[PDB]
Structure to design on (1792 residues):
RNA sequence: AGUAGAAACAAGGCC
RNA sequence: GGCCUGCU
């Protein structure tokens, strides 16, 4: 299992972003520049991201999605997919 | 390829497949595609069975996760994933509970709705061939079969598909996941065809390492290796090698036959030394009986009361005094023990009810007489090494003793009739067959002949004494116990009677091994003066205890009445074998009945009655100074019974050795008397073998004297 | 319910858990025969020596809750001290006789159906007819003869599968009996012993004895029939012949 | 007139009254103390009968070994163990020629058995020398301990459940640098290579008791568990071979022995014409076991297994290879007494190597001085010859080869001989036209025997005309004559239990009536005496008597309670209905129709707490060691009643450091009972497989709960409870 | 002392 | 003095 993340980038605070991972159970983790791994969402959601962020998957496209809304500067991280991907940069 | 099963599948399935791999004993490193194929089969089995539940209805309830409840029934219950023994256990259990038919091969699942089996198999090839293949493998099957194949197609007979279609979409999604993941791997160069059904193995038992060197040191002297010796053996063929060594072997190696003639056999030499002493555990020829004339049977009654009542029947008690000392012990101890026994007997007489079994006081008298606290204390060698006196136990040939004439007279009077019946036989099933009537008549004749015999009285005495002694030893291990010697007979008039020979005091009997010795002291009344044959009473202490008056035409005798007191001992084995003395009756009467049957095979008729009444035929059963004396069949019965009784009484290794080595010579002599040209290779060796068994036992020495007399009378 | 419960209780304690985990099924027999008790060399001597003790026999713990500890006069019937290497308790021989005079009673009607061989022997002898005894030398010649008169023409292994399927239908395994004689024997001995509660092991042993053929070498003179060999001790002797006809004929 | 029974032989031939010459009514001789003296004497005697051999020192065990094979030919009639390899190979070749296909077939069946044999077959044996504790223990216990030690050391091939794999592990253990054992006083001790080699090659020596027919005591040996599998396979091959030889009599019973003896004597005498004379030699072999070299058995087996798979040859050759290097433990030791200080001491035999000789008498001093050079680690090397009839069947094969070597095709002379051999005993019928021919034939037979390491006891042997002879206490005089004195010791209570003793006694009476020509009236007397002894032993008197015992009260109340008192068993104080016609019927079935239904139900109640059945093998089999013979087993007919209890055990283990064995026994028995309740066929057919207990038990719990709901008492509540309890025990076994 | 006979018993061990 | 074992 190889993994490729898409959908990261530079965004406004209070903005929205749709991450996707093309490629079993899946999830999303994030890594901020000063730390190790942080749990985000999986397909459950961590307290720092609950209500804001939704995880979904298509098993006929073979893709797991992370829909992120009302973004904060604290969400600035490399978001990795795992089944590990290389990660997609999200900067808020 | 194994990296795939490292990566994808869960642990549970991989170790299940590894144990299935170990099942049939083939190794995973040589061919792994089978592992992957059957683990995928097992995975489809799970994924098809799980997530499928049922409730009291049919119409399986399907839940993605079993909720906490009693409603966790599984729709399909798995067969495979188990050992062959358990797979067939489940097969048989389902057949016996469901009333269905037993398949001959392994199914994969069972279902309730349709009450039957499922044999799931997903093969690389397309379904529409594998299906009917496995179908013709299985004979006349009602178990429904369902198979998938990688292309994504499904099929089944009856057009039957037993559960939801989304589950089957699951199955084929799993299937193509497998397929286009090997696509990334690239295994189809062999995946379609990797197993062809190979079953072969060679058993290997290789000698190597140390065990090989041992094999190199277990050969004939001039061989260096097991390989060379085996090659020599394989190349060996018979070329007359026994003849060469036979010719070369010295001619002094021979088995020359020495003729055995009438003048060849010489009388067996008997050992010389001090006369032989008495070894019995009770008096045989010099016993005296105090009686009550009660109606009780042998076992019926209480011992102590009967003994006291019998002893009160005699009047004339005197203060006991020493007549013949032990010559090695302390006779005053025996005197005091006798008076103590009398005093405690009176003490029992006074109280309310005679106890069934009495314990005596442990005075110094019986402490010495019973050998108490005399065993050396057991210590460790590291603490006793400088003691000069420390040495082995005395282990040498027993003392040599010459035969005396008392044993001959004792055996003579052990075969004599009596004025009582000493055997009261048990009951048997009423005879129904004529042969049973013949047997009963024969048995009645022998009982009439042997019941009035001192041998039977000795049998009963020994049996009772040894039984009581063993029971007391096993029950009262610690404390000294009193046991009166009791034997019950029946007079000619028919009145039952009890007889009290004396008393036995049993001592400490903590017997662990079959050879451990329990010591007791025996006291017996008698009238035989010990001043006439002192050498026969070396180990006895004899007192004078009273006077007896037996009615005789010479006024009335008013004879003295002495007490033979001694310290004796026995063991568990000796007690057990002495309590089975009744088989002497068997031995003897089996011999007599064999005689009767052998003679009756000549004349076509039972010959018992005339043998026992007419008494015309007689057998040599003893020698008198005039010559050999013959007696009727009854006397032969009594003689053989006495011989067996004395064998049981004076048993010893000497007796066994002499019996064997003298039976050999008896057979040789019989062959000589039969004109069969007997021969021997070393007769002196046989004689030396016989003569080494005769050391000090009176019985074996008497047997040797009898054998010498038989040789003298034979060989004529 | 219970069975898995003592299973869990056993697995609770570490030692029994280890024994259950590391021990494989094949070693079952070994550990089952694992004992410190030597086989007696002289049984008669010790049977005559042990019976003089109090509490010389052994019985299951359940005896402590069916038979009172003492009888009317106070003679003890059982003790609570367990045997050397077992949970059974040592008890007195009176506890046997007590069980035969006030112990629980059952319906022994099916024992005749189980112990078929012995009851058939009894029935055969009860209806036998004896005859005159003829005294003449018998030329006893030694011959191989079958002693079991009810053998169903089956060997040990051949009837062992039948016995399992009759008693232990689930542990048969691969074997499904082909011969139709075995089919009828299974049917008969299944419907006959359907609820008998003596013991599976004794039922299997007696079925093995009844169906399996067994042969031994004996000195015979005449006869040679299975029914005439069981009474060989009563019909033939050293110098006498007793004509006999068992009840079967 | 003086009575003399022996004079009876002047009218009755010796064999017609030979029973009188068997004093089997008294206690047989027993040994009292150590058997170390006998062991040392046997070792020295075995080594000095082969003194002229050649000495070597094993590079593995470091022990001195004496090889007499191919040594100088004997020049005297004394016993000699100088067997010649070529002569014995030629004898085996002639045996094969006279019986073509014998070796190949026997090897085929032996190969089948070896490759299908299981490990559990080793449990079916009597005492064996466990090396884990250096003591004799039951075969099953020793096997379990050795398997545990092997598994702890890393040898787990025996988990395959095959005896061949167990032997593979045993051999692999020989090449290990350091093994570990357990000792209780638990301490883990390390055994180096040489120490373990000697512990696996050693034998335990004891003194034989209850041996009737000789003044002196003898010593016997018991091997370990590593070597018993090879011995089993070798003896299987030897038995398969001897079963094809009519001249052998070891693998058969007594009646077959008599039949073969009669056949051979008739064949030899009848075929002999008027011109040929016939003579029978009743021969015994002196020092039979001490003069049989294991190397010669190795030669015989490697000749037998020619043109066979090499693995079969290796596995069958391993046994004699180990016997050739066998060691013997000296014994218990020696006990000393000091009368001056009034004490006693017990020194173990292992100190004989270094202990001073001031404590020993002259005879023992010299024995120790002679045996010391062979002492290695408290045990003496006994390479030259076998100790006690471990290879009985191979010895019988060698004797049969000797017997067949005189079939008149190899004699090349007018004289010829045949006969029957059973180890240590033989009957030899030799025919020749004249006395000179008979003398030459017997001389050549003796000479050939001396070339194979077999000696004829001239002192215990004699030759007469054919028609009268002896063989293993069977006296033939124009037809075998019954003795009945050999079976006399078996007429008492066996000592198993009440019902078992009754059935065994009646069956023994019946058998001795059938075989040993026991008379009808004698049989009735035996029944009466046996019933008397039985009642007096089990305290079960007629009940209508006033014999007060520890059991006379309950018996009397049962008597007064019963209405039809004729149905009461003798064990419960009832009348005896046995007779000559009823000796083949169990007591329960003979009194079945007379019992009251209440007493009948109380007696034969399955729920009785007394009856205990362990395995199919021990249901109605009683091991009675017969007098003058090896231990034997008998099938006795009995009905499982409340009287079928099993007696108390020893109970002396509680005072020994080996006290934990009882706890292990209890736990193993609890687990076995649980498994049996889970697997009812555990007893009748021993389960097989490679899974562990809890897996099978939990999985069968799953399935049985399931199906017993699909019809039965279980309910959904209970079924789910069982399922989740199974899960609970699963996660418990996880941790 | 006694039993017994090529070595033992005439209680053992543990506190 | 108290308690344990009797083929280990």
């Amino acid at each position: 299992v190889q993994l490729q993340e898409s959908g990261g980038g530079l965004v406004q605070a209070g903005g929205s972003l749709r991450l996707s991972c093309a490629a079993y159970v899946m999830g999303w983790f994030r890594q901020a520049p000063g730390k190790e791994r942080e749990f985000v969402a999986a397909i459950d959601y961590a307290d720092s991201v609950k209500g804001r962020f939704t995880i979904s998957r298509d098993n006929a496209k073979n893709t797991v999605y992370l829909e992120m809304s009302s973004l904060k500067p604290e969400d600035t991280a490399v978001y990795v997919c795992a089944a590990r991907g290389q990660g997609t940069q999200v900067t808020v | 390829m194994e990296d795939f099963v490292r990566q994808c599948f869960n642990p549970m399935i991989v170790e299940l497949a590894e144990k299935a791999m170990k099942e049939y004993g083939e190794d995973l490193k040589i061919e792994t595609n089978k592992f992957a194929a059957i683990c995928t089969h097992l995975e489809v089995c799970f994924m098809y069975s799980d997530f499928h539940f049922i409730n009291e209805r049919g119409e399986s309830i399907i839940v993605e996760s079993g909720d906490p409840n009693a409603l966790l029934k599984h729709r399909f219950e798995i067969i495979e994933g188990r050992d062959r023994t358990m797979a067939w256990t489940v097969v048989n259990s389902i057949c016996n509970t469901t009333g269905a038919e037993k398949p001959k091969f392994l199914p994969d699942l069972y279902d309730y709705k349709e009450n039957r089996f499922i044999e799931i198999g997903v093969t690389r090839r397309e379904v529409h061939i594998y299906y009917l293949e496995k179908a013709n493998k299985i004979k006349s099957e009602k178990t429904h079969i369902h198979i998938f194949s990688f292309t994504g197609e499904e099929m089944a007979t009856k057009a039957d598909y037993t559960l939801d279609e989304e589950s089957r979409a699951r199955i084929k999604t799993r299937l193509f996941t497998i397929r286009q993941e090997m696509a990334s791997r690239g295994l189809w160069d062999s995946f379609r065809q990797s197993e062809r059904g190979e079953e072969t193995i060679e058993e290997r038992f290789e000698i190597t390492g140390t065990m090989r060197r041992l094999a190199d040191q277990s050969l004939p002297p001039n061989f260096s290796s097991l390989e060379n010796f085996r090659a020599y053996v394989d190349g060996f063929e018979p070329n007359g090698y026994i003849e060469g060594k036979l010719s070369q072997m010295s001619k002094e190696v021979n088995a020359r036959i020495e003729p055995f003639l009438k003048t060849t056999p010489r009388p067996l030499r008997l050992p010389d030394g001090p006369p032989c002493s008495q070894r019995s555990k009770f008096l045989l020829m010099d016993a005296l009986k105090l009686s009550i004339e009660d109606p009780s049977h042998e076992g019926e009654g209480i011992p102590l009361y009967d003994a006291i009542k019998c002893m009160r029947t005699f009047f004339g008690w005197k203060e006991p005094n020493v007549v013949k000392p032990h010559e090695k012990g302390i006779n005053p101890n025996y005197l005091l023990a006798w008076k103590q026994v009398l005093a405690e007997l009176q003490d029992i007489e006074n109280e309310e009810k005679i106890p069934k079994t009495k314990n005596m006081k442990k005075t110094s008298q019986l402490k010495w007489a019973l050998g108490e606290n005399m065993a050396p204390e057991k210590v460790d060698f590291d603490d006793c090494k400088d003691v000069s006196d420390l040495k082995q136990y005395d282990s040498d040939e027993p003392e040599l003793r010459s035969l005396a004439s008392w044993i001959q007279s004792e055996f003579n009077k052990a075969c004599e009739l009596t004025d009582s019946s000493w055997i009261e036989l048990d009951e048997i099933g009423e005879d129904v067959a004529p042969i049973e009537h013949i047997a009963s008549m024969r048995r009645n004749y022998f009982t009439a002949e042997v019941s009035h015999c001192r041998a039977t009285e000795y049998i009963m005495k020994g049996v009772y004494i040894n039984t009581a002694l063993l029971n007391a030893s096993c029950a009262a291990m610690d404390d000294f116990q009193l046991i009166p010697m009791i034997s019950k007979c029946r007079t000619k008039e028919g009145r039952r009677k009890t007889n009290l020979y004396g008393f036995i005091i049993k001592g400490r009997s903590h017997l662990r091994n079959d050879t451990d010795v329990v010591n007791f002291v025996s006291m017996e009344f008698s009238l035989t003066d010990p001043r006439l044959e002192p050498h026969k009473w070396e180990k006895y202490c004899v007192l004078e205890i009273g006077d007896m008056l037996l009615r005789s035409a010479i006024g009335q005798v008013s004879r003295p009445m002495f007490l033979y007191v001694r310290t004796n001992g026995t063991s568990k084995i000796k007690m057990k074998w002495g309590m089975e003395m009744r088989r002497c009756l068997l031995q003897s009467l089996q011999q007599i009945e064999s005689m009767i049957e052998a003679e009756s095979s000549v004349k076509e008729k039972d010959m018992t009655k005339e043998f026992f009444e007419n008494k015309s035929e007689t057998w040599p059963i003893g020698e008198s100074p005039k010559g050999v004396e013959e007696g009727s069949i009854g006397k032969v019965c009594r003689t053989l019974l006495a011989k067996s009784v004395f064998n049981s009484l004076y048993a010893s290794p000497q007796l066994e050795g002499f019996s064997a080595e003298s039976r050999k010579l008896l057979l040789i002599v019989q062959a000589l008397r039969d004109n069969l040209e007997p021969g021997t290779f070393d007769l002196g060796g046989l004689y030396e073998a016989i003569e080494e068994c005769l050391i000090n036992d009176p019985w074996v020495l008497l047997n040797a004297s009898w054998f010498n007399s038989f040789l003298t009378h034979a060989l004529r | 319910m219970e069975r898995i419960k003592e299973l869990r209780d056993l697995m609770s304690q570490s030692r029994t858990r280890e024994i259950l985990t590391k021990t494989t099924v094949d070693h079952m027999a070994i550990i089952k025969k694992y004992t410190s008790g030597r086989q007696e060399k002289n049984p008669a001597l010790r049977m005559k020596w042990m019976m003089a003790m109090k509490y010389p026999i052994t019985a299951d713990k359940r005896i402590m809750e069916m038979i009172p500890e003492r009888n009317e006069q106070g003679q003890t019937l059982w003790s609570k001290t367990n045997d050397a290497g077992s949970d059974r308790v040592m008890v007195s021989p009176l506890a046997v006789t007590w069980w035969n005079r006030n112990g629980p009673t059952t319906s022994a009607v099916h024992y005749p159906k189980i112990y078929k061989t012995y009851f058939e022997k009894v029935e055969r002898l009860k209806h036998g007819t004896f005859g005159p005894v003829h005294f003449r030398n018998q030329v006893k010649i030694r011959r191989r003869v079958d002693i079991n008169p009810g053998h169903a023409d089956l060997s040990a292994k051949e009837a062992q599968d039948v016995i399992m399927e009759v008693v232990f239908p689930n542990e048969v395994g691969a074997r499904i009996l082909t011969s139709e004689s075995q089919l009828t024997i299974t049917k008969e001995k299944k419907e006959e012993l359907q609820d008998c509660k003596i013991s599976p092991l004794m039922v299997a042993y007696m079925l093995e004895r009844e169906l399996v053929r067994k042969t031994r070498f004996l000195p015979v003179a005449g006869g040679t029939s299975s029914v005439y060999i069981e009474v060989l001790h009563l019909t033939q002797g050293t110098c006498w012949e007793q004509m006999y006809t068992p009840g079967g004929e | 007139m003086d009575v003399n029974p022996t004079l009876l032989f002047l009218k009755v031939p010796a064999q017609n009254a030979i029973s009188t010459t068997f004093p089997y009514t008294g206690d047989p001789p027993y040994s009292h103390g150590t058997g170390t003296g006998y062991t040392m004497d046997t070792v020295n005697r075995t080594h000095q009968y082969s003194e002229k051999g050649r000495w070597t020192t094993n590079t593995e065990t470091g022990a001195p070994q004496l090889n007499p094979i191919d040594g100088p030919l004997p020049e005297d009639n004394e016993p000699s163990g100088y067997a010649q390899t070529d002569c014995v190979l030629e004898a085996m070749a002639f045996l094969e020629e006279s019986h073509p296909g014998i070796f190949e077939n026997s090897c085929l069946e032996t190969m089948e058995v070896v490759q299908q044999t299981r490990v559990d077959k080793l449990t079916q044996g009597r005492q064996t020398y466990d090396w884990t504790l250096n003591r004799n223990q039951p075969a099953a216990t020793a096997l379990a301990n050795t398997i545990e030690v092997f598994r702890s050391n890393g040898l787990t091939a025996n988990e395959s459940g095959r005896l061949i794999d167990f032997l593979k592990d045993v051999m692999e253990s020989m090449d290990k640098e350091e093994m570990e054992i357990t000792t209780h006083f638990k301490k883990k001790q390390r055994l180096n290579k040489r120490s373990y080699l000697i512990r696996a090659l050693t034998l335990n020596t004891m003194t034989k008791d209850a041996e009737r027919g000789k003044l002196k005591r003898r010593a016997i040996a018991t091997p370990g568990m590593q070597i018993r599998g090879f011995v089993y396979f070798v003896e299987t091959l030897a038995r398969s071979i001897c079963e094809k030889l009519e001249q052998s009599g070891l693998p058969v019973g007594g009646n077959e022995k008599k039949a073969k003896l009669a056949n051979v004597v008739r064949k030899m005498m009848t075929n002999s014409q008027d011109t040929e004379l016939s003579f029978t030699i009743t021969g015994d072999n002196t020092k039979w076991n001490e003069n049989q070299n294991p190397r010669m058995f190795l030669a015989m087996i490697t000749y037998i297994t020619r043109n066979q798979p090499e693995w079969f040859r290796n596995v069958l050759s391993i046994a004699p290879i180990m016997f050739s290097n066998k060691m013997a433990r000296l014994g218990k030791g020696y006990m000393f007494e000091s009368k001056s200080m009034k004490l006693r001491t017990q020194i173990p035999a292992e100190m004989l190597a270094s202990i001073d000789l001031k404590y020993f008498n002259d005879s023992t001093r010299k024995k120790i001085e002679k045996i010391r050079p062979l002492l290695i680690d408290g045990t003496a090397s006994l390479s030259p010859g076998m100790m006690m009839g471990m290879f009985n069947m191979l010895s019988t094969v060698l004797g049969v080869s000797i017997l067949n070597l005189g079939q008149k095709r190899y004699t090349k002379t007018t004289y010829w001989w045949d006969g029957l051999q059973s180890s240590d005993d033989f009957a030899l019928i030799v025919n020749a036209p004249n006395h000179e021919g008979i003398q030459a034939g017997v001389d050549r037979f003796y000479r050939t025997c001396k070339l194979l390491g077999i000696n004829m006891s001239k002192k215990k042997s004699y030759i007469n005309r054919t028609g009268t002879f002896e063989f293993t206490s069977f006296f033939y005089r124009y037809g075998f004559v019954a003795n009945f004195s050999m079976e006399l010791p078996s007429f008492g209570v066996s000592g198993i239990n009440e019902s078992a003793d009754m059935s065994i006694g009646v069956t023994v009476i019946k058998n001795n009536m059938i075989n040993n020509d026991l008379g009808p009236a004698t049989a009735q007397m035996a029944l009466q005496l046996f019933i008397k002894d039985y009642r007096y032993t089990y305290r079960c008197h007629r009940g209508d008597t006033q014999i007060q015992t520890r059991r006379s009260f309950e018996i009397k109340k049962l008597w007064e309670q019963t209405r039809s008192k004729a149905g009461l068993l003798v064990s419960d104080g009832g009348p005896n209905l046995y007779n000559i016609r009823n000796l083949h019927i169990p007591e329960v079935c003979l009194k079945w129709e007379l019992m009251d239904e209440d007493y009948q139900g109380r007696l034969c109640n399955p729920l009785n707490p007394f009856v205990s059945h362990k395995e199919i093998e021990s249901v109605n089999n009683a091991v009675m060691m017969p007098a003058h013979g090896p231990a034997k087993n008998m099938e006795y007919d009995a009905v499982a009643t409340t009287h079928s209890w099993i007696p108390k055990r020893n109970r002396s283990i509680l005072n020994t450091s080996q006290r934990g064995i009882l706890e292990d026994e209890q736990m193993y028995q609890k687990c076995c009972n649980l498994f049996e309740k889970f697997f009812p066929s555990s007893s009748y057919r021993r389960p097989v497989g490679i899974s562990s207990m809890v897996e099978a038990m939990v999985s069968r719990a799953r399935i049985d709960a399931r199906i017993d709901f699909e019809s039965g008492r279980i309910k959904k509540e209970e079924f789910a409870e069982i399922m989740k309890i199974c899960s609970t025990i699963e996660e418990l076994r996880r941790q």
